[PDB]
Design a binder for this molecule. Structure first.
Ligand SMILES: [C]C1=C(Br)[C]=C([B]([O])=O)S1
Length: 113
């Protein structure tokens, strides 16, 4: 399948224990994809002051289409020092490792793998 239905635990930024996927654009997108597959990926909603509390490179899920079965279609875009690798629609938030933090919600997405 080119696309996978996922339910992502939405985390408060101050609860996040592991605040990034790694050290290069290529590593963060790789690790993001692995954690998404393994169901160990969380989502932090982007607001004023959220991003500076997280580690670069950032991995965003962005809306790729304008919602099969409730699941918003998204794709992965990385950002390092103001440069994005990928081009997509609006940010649904920033992906982070999930290591058992209690979420505040769940975000249903159809991910282009
Ligand atoms: C992002 C990816 C998800 Br979810 C599942 C993959 B697979 O085919 O093993 S790759």
């Amino acid at each position: 399948k080119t696309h996978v239905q996922l339910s992502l635990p939405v985390l408060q930024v101050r609860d996040v224990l592991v605040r990034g996927f790694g050290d290069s654009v290529e590593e963060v997108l790789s690790e993001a994809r692995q954690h998404l597959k393994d169901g160990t990926c969380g989502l932090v909603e982007v607001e004023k002051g959220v991003l500076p509390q997280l580690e670069q490179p950032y991995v965003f899920i962005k809306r790729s289409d304008a919602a099969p079965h409730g699941h918003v279609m998204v794709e992965l875009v990385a950002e390092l020092e103001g440069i994005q690798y990928g081009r997509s629609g609006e940010t649904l938030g920033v992906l982070v490792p999930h290591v058992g933090e209690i979420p505040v919600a769940y975000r249903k997405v159809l991910l282009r793998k």
